[PDB]
Write a protein that binds this DNA or RNA. Structure first.
Lengths: 95, 72, 62, 80, 81, 73, 162, 83, 82
RNA sequence: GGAUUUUUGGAGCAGGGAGAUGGAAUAGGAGCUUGCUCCGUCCACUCCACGCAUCGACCUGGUAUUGCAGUACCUCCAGGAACGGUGC
């Protein structure tokens, strides 16, 4: 409960998920890398242990072969993501 | 004998090539990978089949992709 | 039976949410909010709030 | 805390679920439990290369979902 | 009746030997992990040394050094040295 | 928290199908409640008929979705 | 007497003899072929045992149908739009029926899926070259009068009546 | 807690059932010993490996983790689980 | 909640790990939610491998099937309760 | 109660080569519509290496059995591959 959520903030902040912790305390738009090759770019609004992150200004792109694959691109602002389909959660993309 | 904790701790910060389950080999200094095995590197570049291609740097991977991790 | 949706009311409200979602997924604008939606969906032939020289015209047609 | 509890803030809520078998569906789900278990309703579903298939009472799984989209009139901080 | 010889007992005897073995993988039986394990834990997430990827069809070997392969993508191993 | 029932099958011959379509032909030798059935005198069987004797395979139930019997035990 | 979706929903839609979805409506003498699609895409057999249906007609769009019992009925003719409403159809068992003349075999041939058929106990039975007309008009058929079709029969049935 | 699924598996063990696994490994035979973790021991089974040469082996250890489904006694349709 | 507990006992199309639809008169749930589908069948795509050949589905029936928990992609109703 | 059996996922993807072989009416670009040239998505025929084997069901004719029991599926010879997934 109380001490557990204290250690939980310390874990999300000073552990591996520091990228999403900075996306949450810094309001960064971060690259959640899917294990299924669908690149969604956007913020991180709700984030926790299992890499479950809710992203704002979400834009999903895919390599869609109709040929030479095009970047299928759409932008649903608010949208949630569970951490199973995620391979990574990277704080900073160059765009 | 050098268990997961000491080995991945002496390589957490050592520039690791970490192969993910789709060809992704990260080349960079890990931040921390605790018992949850959640990886995260600082200034790591992307590789496909060992070819450095991307510049995202400090990126935090779910262990569910991780195939291998070595400190180059 | 199928001519009345949940809130539509058989002739009380209509389905603007679906075209709104299509326009959202098209334009992707961090301020494409109630005022912009209502202004684009009320007028007839103003200088439109999106390019009609793209598929926005076809989406309006749908 | 987890965002499973943030998705627990969804009932009478207009959502869009992109599920595990290349699925993308519009749905007002019926009720969601702690393990993401969110059963769809009046949902128009399309898996990979599919049609707008309709389910009036369907039960979309957990770890066999990929992405969730919440309402537009949904305050995020109030939902988590 | 008969007593259990743990897979952790196998991995422990292998590590104590500091022996070189090639290990199997998941959903791709073409590639084998040729190397030695350095240590272990209660989890059987295999840590490795001087390892290399060895392909059946391609016939190549790409070395890593002291690599830490996944724990769930292990199947078994053959002690080659 | 219950060990598996390989009890009369122990010290006997099984031909197992593990992931990668592979087969491990061997003796039931050791396990855990994790079902990690370990086969000594166990040999691999590939996609092609090629087979190599592996010495002592500790084959995790992480993949092996089948194994048939050579005898009655 | 009104044959409704009362008697079609209350009908039994469950495991048939050959382990398929059959929907029996035995014991109604139903002469009205209406309100049937409310089988709801979970049915392949429509059975009307003890019926007086003025002819063969009146079914809905069933792309799945796999058996139909129109025996012990009042079938006099054979209606037209049968195939597009039964493309999965092989079993349309209309024995104990009252088909008479080969003009009741006009829509019989347009199906690509007919193999298991029965029109037994009809005055189209003892007529000469009646099975010949059948083995001409039914290409993909395999079960005719509960004994296999023949390539010799097909030769006769194509070659004759030029 | 305890699963009426596991009660169904216990009513399906011991006799001829037909398990169906991940890659198509389907074994129709005496599913002798199944433990609630579903590592099903089958006996005198005919398993296809999806290969269409659905050949008969003896005392197979077909894990249930890959088990897509399991055709059980058609006589316990009136189970105590559902009733 | 136990959402399906109202929609059980009817012929319900349960979805697969590989994309089939299987209309079994579903019985019950679990914490793993492993399905016990009675009077249950299956049907999947008979892929033509081509376009001038069209796509169908060959009929398979297991009867009563104990679908292990790793199966469900969804559970919808395709038959009212008989 | 996201680590080797089920619900925080190994999921995604792509169909082997070619001939002055061909169809896109309403749908592709440039040569600034028509005509004509080349170009980045399939199928029908034909050449290879009917993409290669197994088996299963079936169509063909011949062929053994007259028999009572609750079914994965029960003849044998021979052709063809209309259909399924298993190894490359």
């Amino acid at each position: 409960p109380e001490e557990l959520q204290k250690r939980e903030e310390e874990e999300f902040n000073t552990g591996p998920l520091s990228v999403l912790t900075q996306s949450v305390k810094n309001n960064t738009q971060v690259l959640i890398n899917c294990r299924n090759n669908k690149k969604l770019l956007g913020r991180v609004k709700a984030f926790d242990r299992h890499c479950n992150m809710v992203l704002e200004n979400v834009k999903e792109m895919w390599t869609e072969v109709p040929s030479k694959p095009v970047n299928k691109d759409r932008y649903i602002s608010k949208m949630f993501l569970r951490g199973d389909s995620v391979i990574v959660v990277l704080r900073n993309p160059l765009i | 004998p050098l268990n997961p904790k000491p080995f991945l701790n002496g390589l957490t910060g050592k520039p690791v090539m970490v192969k993910l389950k789709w060809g992704m080999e990260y080349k960079g200094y890990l931040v921390s990978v605790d018992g949850y095995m959640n990886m995260q590197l600082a200034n790591t570049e992307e590789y496909i089949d060992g070819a450095l291609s991307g510049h995202l740097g400090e990126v935090l991977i779910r262990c569910n992709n991780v195939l291998y991790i070595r400190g180059v | 039976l199928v001519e009345f949706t949940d809130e539509e009311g058989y002739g009380r409200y209509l389905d603007l949410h679906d075209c709104y979602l299509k326009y959202i997924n098209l334009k992707a604008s961090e301020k494409l909010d109630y005022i912009t939606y209502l202004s684009i969906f009320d007028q007839l032939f103003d200088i439109p709030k999106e390019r009609k020289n793209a598929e926005y015209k076809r989406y309006l047609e749908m | 805390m987890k965002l499973v509890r943030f998705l627990m803030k969804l009932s009478h809520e207009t959502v869009t679920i992109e599920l595990k078998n290349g699925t993308q569906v519009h749905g007002t789900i019926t009720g969601v439990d702690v393990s993401m278990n969110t059963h769809l309703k009046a949902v128009k579903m399309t898996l990979k290369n599919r049609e707008p298939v309709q389910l009036e009472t369907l039960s979309i799984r957990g770890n066999n979902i990929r992405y969730f989209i919440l309402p537009d009139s949904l305050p995020l901080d109030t939902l988590l | 009746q008969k007593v259990m010889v743990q897979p952790i007992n196998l991995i422990f005897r292998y590590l104590q030997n500091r022996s070189r073995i090639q290990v199997w993988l998941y959903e791709q039986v073409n590639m084998r992990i040729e190397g030695c394990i350095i240590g272990f834990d209660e989890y059987m997430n295999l840590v490795l040394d001087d390892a290399e990827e060895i392909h059946s069809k391609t016939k190549s070997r790409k070395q890593l050094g002291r690599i830490m392969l996944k724990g769930d993508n292990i199947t078994l191993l053959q002690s080659v040295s | 928290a219950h060990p598996p029932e390989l009890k009369k099958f122990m010290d006997k011959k099984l031909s197992l199908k593990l992931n990668g379509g592979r087969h491990v032909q061997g003796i039931l030798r050791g396990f855990d409640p994790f079902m990690n059935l370990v086969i000594d005198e166990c040999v691999e069987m590939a996609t092609s008929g090629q087979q190599n004797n592996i010495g002592m395979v500790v084959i995790r139930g992480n993949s092996i979705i089948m194994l048939e019997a050579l005898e009655r035990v | 007497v009104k044959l409704t979706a009362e008697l079609i929903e209350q009908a039994a839609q469950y495991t048939n003899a050959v382990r398929d979805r059959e929907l029996d409506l035995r014991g109604y003498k139903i002469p009205v072929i209406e309100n049937l699609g409310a089988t709801l895409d979970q049915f392949d057999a429509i059975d009307f045992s003890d019926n007086e249906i003025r002819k063969l007609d009146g079914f809905p769009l069933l792309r799945r149908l796999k058996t139909l019992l129109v025996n012990n009925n009042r079938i006099c003719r054979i209606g037209e739009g049968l195939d597009q409403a039964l493309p999965c159809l092989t079993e349309l068992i209309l024995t104990n029926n009252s088909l008479v003349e080969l003009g009741d075999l006009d829509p019989l041939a347009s199906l690509k899926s007919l193999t298991y058929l029965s029109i037994l106990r009809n005055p189209v039975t003892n007529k000469k070259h009646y099975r010949l007309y059948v083995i001409y008009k039914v290409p993909q058929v395999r079960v005719l009068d509960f004994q296999k079709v023949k390539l010799k029969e097909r030769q006769e049935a194509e070659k004759m009546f030029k | 807690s305890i699963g009426v699924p596991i009660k169904v598996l216990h009513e399906a063990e011991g006799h001829i059932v037909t398990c169906e696994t991940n890659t198509g490994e389907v074994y129709r035979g005496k599913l002798i010993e199944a433990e609630d973790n579903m590592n099903c021991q089958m006996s005198n089974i005919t398993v296809t490996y999806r290969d269409g040469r659905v050949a008969q082996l003896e005392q197979v250890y077909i894990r249930g983790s890959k088990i897509r489904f399991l055709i059980l006694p058609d006589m316990l349709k009136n189970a105590p689980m559902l009733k | 909640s136990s959402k399906m507990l109202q929609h059980i006992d009817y012929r319900m199309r349960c979805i697969l790990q590989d994309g089939r639809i299987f209309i079994g008169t579903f019985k019950a749930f679990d914490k793993h939610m492993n399905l016990i589908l009675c009077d249950c069948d299956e049907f999947r795509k008979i892929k033509p491998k081509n376009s001038k050949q069209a796509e169908r589905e060959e009929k398979r029936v297991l009867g009563l099937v104990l679908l292990r928990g790793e199966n469900l992609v969804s559970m919808t109703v395709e038959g009212p309760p008989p």
